Amino acid sequence: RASVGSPGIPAQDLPFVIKAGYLEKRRKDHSFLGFEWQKRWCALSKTVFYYYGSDKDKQQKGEFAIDGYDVRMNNTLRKDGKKDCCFEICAPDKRIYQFTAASPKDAEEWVQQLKFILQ
């Protein structure tokens, strides 16, 4: 872990938000209670991607800088009728954040926005 954690910032207060919206993020955990894909309010503040339980939370569940990462649509992350709504953001250390959007267009807009930054 880091020596000093990321400051908690209310969702409403985030600066320089390029794009924001509800997505579902896939759980890492093999064994869990509830759904694999958990609803998260996501926001890209400059190059930092924040995620929250809701768009009114006072503190993020987590965040990461996208610098040096890659992004793609991925139609294999689920079998359900949402197969064409999923994309992932891949880090230099092969950590992956995997997301489902409300529609294929919504996912593609996220990817385009991120892809345009990752250069």
From Swiss-Prot:
Its main location: cytoplasm. It comes from the Eukaryota. One of its GO terms (cellular component) is cytoplasm. Residues 16-119 form the PH domain. GO terms for biological process: B cell activation; negative regulation of cell population proliferation. Keywords: B-cell activation, Cytoplasm, Phosphoprotein, SH3 domain. Disruption phenotype: Mice are healthy and do not display any obvious abnormality. They have normal T-cell, platelet and macrophage function, but show reduced levels of spontaneous immunoglobulins in the serum, and defects in B-cell proliferation. In case of infection with Y.pseudotuberculosis, dephosphorylated by bacterial phosphatase yopH. The keyword Cytoplasm applies. The modification Phosphotyrosine is found at residues 51, 97. Induction: By IL-6 in myeloid cells. It is found in: Cytoplasm. Expressed in kidney, lung, liver, spleen, bone marrow and testis. Present in T-cells, B-cells, and all cells of the myelomonocytic lineage. Present in all brain regions, with highest levels in neurons from the Purkinje cell layer, hippocampal gyrus, cortex and substantia nigra (at protein level). Interacts with LAT, GRB2, PTK2B and PRAM1. Homodimer. Interacts with FYB1, which is required for SKAP2 protein stability. Interacts with PTPNS1. Part of a complex consisting of SKAP2, FYB1 and PTPNS1. Part of a complex consisting of SKAP2, FYB1 and PIRB. May interact with actin. May interact with FYN, HCK and LYN. Interacts with FASLG. Belongs to the SKAP family. May be involved in B-cell and macrophage adhesion processes. In B-cells, may act by coupling the B-cell receptor (BCR) to integrin activation. May play a role in src signaling pathway. The SH3 domain interacts with FYB1 and PTK2B. This is Src kinase-associated phosphoprotein 2. It comes from Mus musculus. The chain holds residues 109 to 219 of 358 of the full protein.
